[PDB]
Design a protein around this ligand. Structure first.
Ligand SMILES: [Ca+2]
Ligand SMILES: [Ca+2]
Ligand SMILES: [Ca+2]
Ligand SMILES: [Ca+2]
Ligand SMILES: [Ca+2]
Ligand SMILES: [Ca+2]
Ligand SMILES: [Ca+2]
Ligand SMILES: [Ca+2]
Ligand SMILES: [Zn+2]
Ligand SMILES: [Zn+2]
Lengths: 220, 215, 217, 217, 220, 215
């Protein structure tokens, strides 16, 4: 029956284009993530509401609310009633895994006559004292592709610092590079471990010289 | 059982998959459902309003995972001023000629009629070819009042513009009583906007109406 | 001789099936949609930071128009809100004041007792709604909070009070004559009928003795 | 529009590849062929049970015709067998009498020493073939067999003798004047040049003191 | 290019018939097994040569030849120099795994006026004392589909016995079935665990009443 | 690169498999190689000869994994007498009209010429339609002798039969000297058979020749 079978093909060829176009949609779908977006708003709002704990303290589960000193933030011993201060997701070492690279635009408004340029924070190394887990000590490389007299230049420096789970803060100070570089400071308050809000500051006053919103670079 | 049953098996199977296919194409469309997008984006806005201003007084935020402030005078001007492009990719005029919006009062401390409703008809709308950031409008503000001593109807006409800069249409005072309308759009909605009636000079709010696009 | 064209057609299909499974698979490895009960909580948390015109003793209609009507008028049988939002079921849900209802959280005291964060439990013991005065659902409950986390002693004061549909707030005080303990205020402005922002107060001045964010069960 | 007929053709093929792999697979899960060196040993073992006409001092040609020629005539340079099998290399292989050659097995004594089964090792120490008398490959070897399985003492007698191409038999005896030990007879009628049926004898009467089936190395 | 591509098919269709016919060959090939046949001859011949060990003894590896009493045949302790008396393949319990069924024709020439009929030995159970492994004790069911006065009858009986690795002998005696049945005796001398040579005999003299060559029935 | 390079890739791959296919078809044929079968089966026979007789004096063994003895008078008779069928599936006559066999002497204690060779030509062969178990033959036994006093040639003719029962052709005595030939076939070979020259009456062997089919 050459017709019903040779035509049942023009039917299949369709599914071929369909299945293909369908691939494109699954690609569009991965970009619009809900459970992620919602998290951005949660964090975005919690930032306004503000943890009900004093500076340097960790707020626990929205049900059994209670304050914990970040010296226990994530130390290995159940300190909160809900143990939220040891919940894996709070202490994902991956946020600042050695090799992670964060880029973004650094808009200056405080201590330098710089044109909106880009900064590239990249974690060099990361130790975690087995007898004091509450902190991830780390070294990193800060580069700044900015334009000066003439063409494209690169003002970079090596940094040392730490990551605090409690506040998801990453502090990077210059490795005594006597060239006077502004310590960078990032907070990963955005609902994920991919994006962070940073500022260049004076190690002393912590005065904010510039705003820098970084994003973790894709490895593909 | 041969050229009959082996041909209707390579067919009832072609469909048995054509289903599993469109079945997914559905689950996908469900996460791209534009109606869900705006609805959520709309929520985002409400929040953006609570957060400290992202950019200076007279600047437009381009959003994204890497923010950039550009002058409001650049939004929808024809030039790509923002790295991401926001300042140029969303330039659709909501209140365009022919459209009608019905406002439901909810706080009226100034209108002369303290009316229950208030229709907003858009007569004409034209954009200057060289200045895309602002679209000029001509609108008739209709009103159905009714007291004991009488029963009036009104259709005051007024000029106004819509700034893609901040999705805010300003309708110049119709009557010489220094009262004008200022409705700022959601950003993602466009079928509902809060309409504040203010004293042009002062910019005092004294009447809020929720306007819905009469569809 | 005959299956020469079919033996492969079934293959072209056995193919699609795989190119699709390798899709439906890459699908599941993607975050699912969020329970509407979550979005609801956001719209709530958010709506709570936004500015609100209703003056003390007034709450806004649940409609699309944020009109303000007096608390004494919600759920009284007469459409008081422009749209009637003050009378639709989603507003007058008794879900909260149901007998046996219990809300708990971790009470962290800031003003009336040594006690270090302990568990607080305000649970409803009985509640009637006078036929002619629906605005209020008069009720009785119990407030219990752990004393010694070790030997598990626990205080249990009996309470009296009502539930305000308008403010969506549970207001309980001690029965009068039983060691004069505490009272408690719980706001269910959290979006649904199971989460609330409770605060143990001192009946007399409604002054906050301690605060605990509660959940239901 | 164009690949609509190709996208599947490559599939009909990607198909065959599998229907075949699932075959080549079911193949390997099948016993491989047997090394020719095995069949050889069978044809041997068997051929040894079959009746043979050659009378003592005679061995049969390796040809297709089982003709019998005197032992003193194999490998002497003159075609003595009907077909010349007594002179082809596969017969006159020195492979066995190669210097350093060593054959061992487990000697189980049945007539001349307490000793419980122990390891026997007859190894060739030197061997020349007189230019004018090829029939025999005169040689010298050593016979060693363990004494005390515990402290590992071991007897090592030196031997003299030759190798008979005909009978394919190694015949060694003690050198005369060294504790008068034993001799040894090894038949390599086992099919190849590495397996033999050795028996430790008493030089004098060739009487079997013990027997051990040997292998080479 | 409709021709070179539409014809490159008449080329593929060929491989389809080929690959198929090839399946048939792989089926024929499984029937003619060499490594198996050779083994049949080895055993067949070794049977003529005869183990160089006295009755009730186990012959070890053709290299380090030596005799072992079958009370050690396969007891768990290395008794032969080559340990061939513990070599797994010698003590494959599977030869007489419970559930194995052996059938074959029983030609009678000694103690019964029976017409060439079939016997069906099927292993019922099989214990193996953990403190004495040298023997597999077992129960089995012997059936004999033979024709008598009229039609097809079945003369069966329950049996108890043992399997000896050393000689690969399986002895099955009647479970005191006072109906006087001839004990069956099988030897798995054939190079495999599938076929065995049996005889019906008197438990006393072990005199051979009949020849019976069994084969393990396929489970498909 | 499109309708050119994507068409020569769905071709150079069709062959890349057509190879792997016939590659296996070879490895298979290698294990079914009939020449290997007979060669091995032939070996089996040699063994069957050493083992105690499988069946009585005048009976034919059907072999297989389940043996059965039937009368030799039944082998190749037309009736299926053996369960397995052996008695009827291998009934091909080796020495058929036209065929020639060359024998190489190797033990001669009786022939009048004690010849080096001995050709065996088969003139005619006919099988009785009702008795298939025996095929009757007419053969010429040729011989090339050569002494000092003379040089003779001989071509003695003799009758004979071939019994499928045991692959043994008996050639009745040619000369009135009571000497006949008896060659028994391998069972699987048929291109080589040992030919024993015997005294018909006694059945005494006194001459062995290996006969090869002259091809
Ligand atoms: Ca802790
Ligand atoms: Ca622009
Ligand atoms: Ca009401
Ligand atoms: Ca305290
Ligand atoms: Ca010679
Ligand atoms: Ca001894
Ligand atoms: Ca043992
Ligand atoms: Ca027959
Ligand atoms: Zn820098
Ligand atoms: Zn029986």
């Amino acid at each position: 029956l050459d017709p019903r079978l040779g035509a049942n093909a023009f039917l299949i060829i369709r599914l071929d284009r369909i299945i293909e176009k369908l691939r494109t949609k699954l690609d569009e779908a991965e970009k619009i993530d809900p459970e992620h977006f919602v998290s951005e708003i949660d964090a975005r709002v919690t930032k306004i509401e503000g943890t009900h704990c004093e500076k340097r303290t960790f707020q626990c589960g929205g049900n059994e609310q209670e304050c914990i000193s970040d010296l226990l933030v994530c130390d290995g011993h159940k300190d909160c009633h809900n143990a939220h201060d040891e919940d894996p997701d709070v202490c994902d070492t991956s946020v600042v895994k050695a090799g992670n690279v964060f880029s973004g635009t650094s808009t200056w408004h405080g201590c330098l006559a710089r044109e909106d340029h880009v900064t590239r924070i990249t974690i060099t190394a990361s130790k975690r004292r087995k007898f004091f887990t509450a902190r991830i000590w780390l070294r990193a490389l800060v580069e700044s592709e900015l334009e000066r007299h003439g063409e494209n230049v690169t003002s970079s420096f090596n940094a040392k610092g730490y990551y605090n789970f409690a506040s998801r803060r990453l502090i990077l100070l210059p490795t005594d590079d006597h060239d006077d570089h502004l310590a960078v400071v990032c907070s990963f308050n955005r609902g994920d471990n991919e994006r962070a809000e940073c500022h260049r500051v004076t190690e002393a006053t912590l005065h904010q010289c510039a705003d820098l919103f970084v994003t973790l670079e894709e490895h593909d | 059982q041969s050229h009959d049953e082996i041909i209707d098996k390579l067919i009832e199977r072609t469909n048995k998959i054509t289903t599993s296919i469109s079945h997914v194409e559905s689950l996908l469309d469900d996460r791209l459902d534009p109606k869900r997008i705006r609805k959520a984006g709309s929520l985002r806005h409400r929040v953006e309003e609570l957060e400290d201003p992202s950019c200076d007084e007279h600047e437009h935020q381009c959003g994204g995972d890497d923010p950039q402030c550009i002058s409001k005078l650049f939004v929808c001007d024809g030039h790509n001023d923002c790295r991401n492009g926001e300042d140029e990719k969303d330039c659709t005029l909501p209140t365009k000629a022919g459209d009608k919006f019905i406002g439901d009062v909810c706080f009226d401390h100034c209108t002369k009629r303290r009316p229950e409703h208030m229709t907003l008809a858009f007569e004409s709308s034209s954009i200057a070819a060289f200045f895309t950031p602002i679209a000029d409008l001509h609108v008739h503000i209709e009103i159905e009042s009714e007291t004991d001593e009488d029963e009036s109807e009104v259709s005051m006409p007024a000029d106004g513009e819509y700034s893609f800069a901040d999705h805010r249409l300003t309708i110049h005072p119709p009557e010489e009583d220094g009262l004008g309308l200022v409705g700022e759009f959601d950003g993602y909605n466009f079928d509902r906007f809060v309409g504040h009636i203010v004293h042009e000079l002062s910019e005092e709010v004294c009447a809020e109406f929720i306007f819905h696009r009469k569809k | 001789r005959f299956q020469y064209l079919v033996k492969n057609q079934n293959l072209h299909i056995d193919y699609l099936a795989k190119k699709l499974h390798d899709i439906e698979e890459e699908y599941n490895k993607l975050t699912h949609d969020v329970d509407k009960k979550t979005i609801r909580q956001l719209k709530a948390r958010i709506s709570n930071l936004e500015e609100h015109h209703c003056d003390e003793h007034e709450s806004e209609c649940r409609g699309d128009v944020p009109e303000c009507i007096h608390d004494l008028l919600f759920c009284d049988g007469e459409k008081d809100c422009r749209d009637g939002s003050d009378e639709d079921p989603e507003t007058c849900s008794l879900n909260i004041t149901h007998v046996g209802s219990s809300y708990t959280g971790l009470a962290t005291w800031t003003s009336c007792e040594d006690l270090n964060p302990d568990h607080a439990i305000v649970t409803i013991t009985a509640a009637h709604r006078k036929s002619f005065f629906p605005n209020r659902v008069w009720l009785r409950a119990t407030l219990s909070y752990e004393l010694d986390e070790h030997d598990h002693t626990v205080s249990t004061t009996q309470l009296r009070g009502f539930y305000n549909f308008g403010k969506r707030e549970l207001l309980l005080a001690p029965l009068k004559g039983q060691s004069e303990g505490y009272g408690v205020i719980c706001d269910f402005n959290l979006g649904d009928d199971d989460h609330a922002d409770c605060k143990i107060v001192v009946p007399s001045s409604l002054f906050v003795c301690a605060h605990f964010n509660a959940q239901r069960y």
